[PDB]
Amino acid sequence: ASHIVGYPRMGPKRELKFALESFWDGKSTAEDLQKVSADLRSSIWKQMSAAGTKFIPSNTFAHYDQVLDTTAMLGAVPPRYGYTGGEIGLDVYFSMARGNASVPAMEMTKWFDTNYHYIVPELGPEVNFSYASHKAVNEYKEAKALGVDTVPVLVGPVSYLLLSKAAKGVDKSFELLSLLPKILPIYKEVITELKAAGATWIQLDEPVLVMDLEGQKLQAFTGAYAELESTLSGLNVLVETYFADIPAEAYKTLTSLKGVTAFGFDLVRGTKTLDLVKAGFPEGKYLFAGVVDGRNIWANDFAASLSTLQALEGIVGKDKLVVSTSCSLLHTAVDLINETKLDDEIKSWMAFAAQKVVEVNALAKALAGQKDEALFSANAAALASRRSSPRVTNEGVQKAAAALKGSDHRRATNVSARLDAQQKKLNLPILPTTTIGSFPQTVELREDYVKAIKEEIKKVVDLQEELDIDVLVHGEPERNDMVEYFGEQLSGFAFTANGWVQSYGSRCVKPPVIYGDVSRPKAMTVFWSAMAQSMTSRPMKGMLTGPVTILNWSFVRNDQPRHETCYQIALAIKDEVEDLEKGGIGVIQIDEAALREGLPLRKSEHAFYLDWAVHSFRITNCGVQDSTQIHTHMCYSHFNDIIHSIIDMDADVITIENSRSDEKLLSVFREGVKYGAGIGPGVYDIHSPRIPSSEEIADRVNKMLAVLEQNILWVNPDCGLKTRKYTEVKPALKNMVDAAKLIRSQ
């Protein structure tokens, strides 16, 4: 039959986004929220229903996050919220999700290797779980009433624990998995009610099984799914996994869990699991083949998918094979029908959530012997035009066929013996100041030059008189998005009108689309950077976004290796770096904000990624002068597991986070490393609307001079000042300059 592991919950036009925000502001009531919610759910169900989908998910909808949903189900609310028990409602839920005017919200971290963020449970031996949320069964009955029977989706009990973190105080020796006995009882109460409602299929999301798990942890699954067996009685139980392939030992455990009757596999991002399947698969167990990519935006290759699904019918096919999505469509845009600008030709190469629900069903029909010939013909035709179109393949493809000149290390002249020709061209006071890139925004309007110029002389005239700040920036007023600004000026790019994807809470992102070979046709920055470096007698740093970040924060073409596309981007950026130079920009900053985002989930796959990722960065400025100073920025504070890559980037000066970590951890830049090269961690946390007295900064500064050598230590914020308000940046930066002049007096 057909199946969808999950679905977006924001609405075709982000209906839930505004309803949530409206409710939070007070411009609407709880009931107004629930109306919008129940409506969205109804249309989603009916929609998949009409498409011919056999297994339609229940409980995929969430007001904020699916893990927070399970936290409510288990009555695991942290103490600070003063929860007293009973069915949890909107108040306590959003209290945890976004906090209130006295208690902080719960932490949010990245969900696997996706651009999505979940709310991490705070567990310990002191929490008293309980069945405090009937969302699951409620939705099942709700959909039942509408006439569409669903498959309830719950985050597996053991993955849930593995995704959690001990709350404050919970000693070091505590082992999270020691709570299984406390939460299993509740999973049973839920499963039981689900059966009573008439549910005959259930879905348990256990994605952690695709991680690198030790044997003691894998066993925890076994014990759990044996402890649950009697309750799963008379119920088809499907255990899902996605984002990667399942390790061999993991595959053994998984395929022999009690009560489980079906297995979901990601066969787009974890096809490696196929070999384990051929070697051996259980008896009459169902296999849910996730061949329709639920992580990207491209139209499926019905032809290839078919060949695959058919081979799998070989391994079973006894009506045990179920066509499915590689993962929740939560990770892709809602409907391609709302793309009115993109040209027909390009759109025919794409497919969003709603289109993917259909693909899954066409593929299912084809295996049933009812291949909709008209569907596969348009597909093949769209695939043909994509593989033929000269909008895709290009001679940039040869320029790249040359970048195989071994490495692309920057012209020897060792960084340390290069910082000399630079301080020669520049000359600056030890412990220099500077910012990371942008400044607060004002009025904003969509000639045009003169208006932008004003906003810059403001940021320039300010920096100068702003005590000092040895190295200035233009503020990036002419840039709305750090990734889009550039993509709008590259060849392999395309931009969507409504392709939103949920990032966390009510916040979404609309990723650019890299459809073909990228190349920078004309000068991008240059103009603005050159103009800004003349309103002052101080160094103006050019601003660019590294090729790794641009790649990660876009929907990348699924027809060639990521890196291959990454190197093309690197080649294009490489020009701007060389034109910013010919323009008179002696200091150039290149930020790699999402450097760690493309990190494979398989630990043994890290090496290869960090390599081509770092290489791509070097290709960017390998052909720059020795007097030209390159700066890199990365939004991180933990590098114990990636330091060598930061060093292999070979940057004259780098700026990361810190500002709320030990300046002691900076000794990972010394012992057994001997970095020696420009570096400067954050002294001003730009995520807080509060000021940090010139004393606090002048202090953190000395603390670093203790560890990180003083000979090459810089003083900068924590990041840009775009989200900050000029009334908060004004004084905070002043102090940073003083705190430097101060320690400079030494």
Ligand SMILES: CN1c2c(nc(N)[nH]c2=O)NC[C@@H]1CNc1ccc(C(=O)N[C@@H](CCC(=O)O)C(=O)O)cc1
């Ligand atoms: C910079 N980040 C961001 C993300 N995901 C992507 N693809 N790209 C990004 O810019 N990766 C992680 C990181 C932090 N997360 C985020 C995610 C979304 C928003 C965001 O778009 N915020 C807007 C809402 C815009 C809208 O939905 O209309 C805001 O004003 O809060 C900010 C930071």
Ligand code: MET
């Ligand atoms: C989040 S990476 C920094 C981007 C840009 N340089 C800024 O300062 O906002």
Ligand SMILES: [Zn+2]
């Ligand atoms: Zn940053």
Ligand SMILES: [Zn+2]
């Ligand atoms: Zn190395």
